[PDB]
Every structure is written in structure tokens, then in C-alpha cells.
């Protein structure tokens, strides 16, 4: 009983994929509620209203609510997504009165450069056996951002990054918390916080931190 017919959801690429030129940023078009009686689904893709033909269609997957799910994926050009190109997914099915269209674009508004600060462990952890290192990233727009930790070249495993939070000026801020053993901190070990954003020079910045 799928009265409305199939519905369409269009997802943006992962922040990191659009920023590193070696990555492959993909736009994902998910179609749900496809009926067993009418399962054939056709995809049309448009970049700024111009049809492209390099999209890959994944095969239909049965769902436990006895409905089909079809996903189409289009790899976008890095520059094109960043410059604010509109990507349109047009979906056809016989359970519909007309093809359904969806549109995504990088969030409108002027990009703002993030500011990156490191923060040594608080006085609270002087007795504790492990310490928290903080990486405050603030003043960025849009929220599309990625944060990683590394020490001596090797990526650090024990960290969590808070989601972007809207600040009072319209820009976003977040904090990434790395947890390391106190002893590693006692030693003059240098930990680094790498931040990736579109408004940064070469889409990359790095701030280091140590017991100096």
C-alpha cells in the first residue's frame, strides 16, 4: 500500500572528499518506496541544468518493509561543487504522475576562514592518569569541515570531535578532544591538530601542541 509512489532523497558529498584533490566527491540519489508491481526506475542527472551521462546506478535492494531501494551515484568535480553548482536528480517511475526532481548545492553565503587554537590539559587532570588535549576551531562558514589528530606522523586513535555549533555572528565553531596518556604528555611529545576547510589556504591548516 504505497499510495504516494516512490520518493527521492539527495545527499551531498562528504566534506573531506571535496577538499582533497586526490579524493572522489560523490552526490547520492536514494529512491525509496518502489513497489514490486512497478520496480523500473530511470535516473537523469543535470549539472547547472545540463545533462551529464557518467552516473553509476547501484542495483535494487529489497527492504524488510517489502519495498525496493535504488541508489544512483554521481562523482562531481571538486571545483564545480565548491563554486556552487546545482546538481539535479530526476527520477522516473510508473507509479508517479510525473518525474520527481531534487536539487542540492553547497550552502549559500560567503565563506569564512576558521581560526585554530590548541589548548593544553586543564588543572583537573593533574591527578588523573590520562589527559585531554583540545582543538578549538571557530569562525568558519559553512559547517563543512574535517578535523584529525596526529603525533610523530602517526594518526592518533583516541579522539572525538563535537558537531558544528552555530555561533552568535553566523559562523560555526567546534572543538576536537584528543585523549592521551599523561606520561606521553610529561615527555615533550608534540601532538598536531589538522583542520580541513574550503576557506583555508590549500584547504589545509595544522596547529601543534607540547609541554614547552
Amino acid at each position: 500500500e504505497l499510495l504516494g509512489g516512490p520518493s527521492v532523497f539527495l545527499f551531498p558529498p562528504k566534506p573531506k572528499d571535496t577538499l582533497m584533490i586526490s579524493r572522489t566527491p560523490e552526490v547520492t540519489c536514494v529512491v525509496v518506496d518502489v513497489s514490486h508491481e512497478e520496480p523500473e526506475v530511470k535516473f537523469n542527472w543535470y549539472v547547472d541544468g545540463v545533462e551529464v551521462h557518467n552516473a553509476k546506478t547501484k542495483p535494487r535492494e529489497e527492504q524488510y518493509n517489502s519495498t525496493y531501494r535504488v541508489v544512483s551515484v554521481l562523482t562531481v568535480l571538486h571545483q564545480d561543487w565548491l563554486n556552487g553548482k546545482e546538481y539535479k536528480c530526476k527520477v522516473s517511475n510508473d507509479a508517479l504522475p510525473k518525474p520527481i526532481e531534487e536539487t542540492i548545492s553547497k550552502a549559500k553565503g560567503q565563506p569564512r576562514e576558521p581560526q585554530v587554537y590548541t589548548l593544553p590539559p586543564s588543572r583537573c587532570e593533574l591527578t588523573k592518569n590520562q589527559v585531554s588535549l583540545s582543538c578549538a576551531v571557530k569562525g568558519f562558514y559553512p559547517s563543512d569541515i574535517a578535523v584529525e589528530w596526529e603525533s610523530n606522523g602517526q594518526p592518533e586513535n583516541n579522539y572525538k570531535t563535537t558537531p558544528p555549533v552555530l555561533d552568535s555572528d553566523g559562523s560555526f565553531f567546534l572543538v576536537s578532544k584528543l585523549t592521551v596518556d599523561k606520561s606521553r604528555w610529561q615527555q615533550g611529545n608534540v601532538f598536531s591538530c589538522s583542520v580541513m576547510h574550503e576557506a583555508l589556504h590549500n584547504h589545509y591548516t595544522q596547529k601543534s601542541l607540547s609541554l614547552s
Binding site: L3, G4, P97, K98
Partner: protein
């Protein structure tokens, strides 16, 4: 000398959705007649009094005229075949003050529609749990403006194109 033939629509709606049925009737003389139908000013081989359209396609749009043996050629009648989920239909779109305004929110293929809202100039006027006709008993000047209806077809949120309703003094 001879009566001017008249094309009536059944149902009365000159705007329809694809797959709806429309019967076009020809009133020439009142006594039941060799009938002649026209579409986009060219004859259709149908000689019956009624011209039935089982499922409307976009090609069914255009002007329609009829002529019986005992009548003169009729004035044209427009037909608009739309594509979409919802169409806001009415008998007329021009209302005199204190006249009834009666609207329907018609769905494609007559698909069950629930949580129906009728909106005037962006604001909702009336909400129903199930699809129901919108009705104003006494028209006022404040009832004038832009109208559309929306609702859920299953879980999908769908809406009709806006139609303009004017109220004359």
C-alpha cells in the same frame, strides 16, 4: 432560425488531470440528432451526441466545438489537461458578494488524500483529516486572492498549483 448549439462538460471541470474521464455533450435542438464534433478546428469522426474521453492525455487539450443537424456551430470550449498530483477545481472562479464558494481538491487517479489544507495567500483557511470540499456559504471581499490545496498521499507531501479567486462588488 436555428438554435446555437452548446457544449457542456461532464463533469463541469474545464481543467483536468491526466487519466480523468471527460464526457462532452452537445445541446442542439431539445428533441433527441446527427452530431458533429470539432477539436483544434478539425473534424473528429465521432457522430454521436456525446464525445467520451476515457483517460485524458495532454493531446486532449484545446478548443472544442459541436454542431447538430438542427443547430448552428457552437462557441468554443477550452480544455486543460494538467500533469501532477493535485488540482484545485471549482465551478467558477469569479464570485459576486454573498455567493457560495465551493472548491474541491482533486487527486490524480482519485488517489486517497489525507490531511488536506486549503490555503489563501499562503495562510491556511481550512484543514480536514480526510479529503473534503472547501466551502464558504457567504462570500466577502476578504475571501479574494490566491488559492491552493495540499495534503498527504500516503506519506508523500503533495500540493496543487495556485488558482486566483476574485470577488466582485
Amino acid at each position: 432560425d436555428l438554435p446555437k448549439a452548446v457544449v457542456f462538460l461532464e463533469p463541469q471541470w474545464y481543467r483536468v488531470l491526466e487519466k480523468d474521464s471527460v464526457t462532452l455533450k452537445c445541446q442542439g435542438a431539445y428533441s433527441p440528432q446527427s452530431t458533429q464534433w470539432f477539436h483544434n478546428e478539425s473534424l473528429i469522426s465521432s457522430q454521436a451526441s456525446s464525445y467520451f474521453i476515457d483517460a485524458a492525455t495532454v493531446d486532449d487539450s484545446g478548443e472544442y466545438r459541436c454542431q447538430t443537424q438542427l443547430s448552428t456551430l457552437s462557441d468554443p470550449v477550452q480544455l486543460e489537461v494538467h500533469i501532477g498530483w493535485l488540482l484545485l477545481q471549482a465551478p467558477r472562479w469569479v464570485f459576486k458578494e454573498e455567493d457560495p464558494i465551493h472548491l474541491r481538491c482533486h487527486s490524480w487517479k482519485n488517489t486517497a488524500l489525507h490531511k488536506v489544507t486549503y490555503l489563501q495567500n499562503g495562510k491556511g483557511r481550512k484543514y480536514f483529516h480526510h479529503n473534503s470540499d472547501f466551502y464558504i456559504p457567504k462570500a466577502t471581499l476578504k475571501d479574494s486572492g490566491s488559492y491552493f490545496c495540499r495534503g498527504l498521499v500516503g506519506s508523500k507531501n503533495v500540493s496543487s498549483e495556485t488558482v486566483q479567486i476574485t470577488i466582485t462588488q
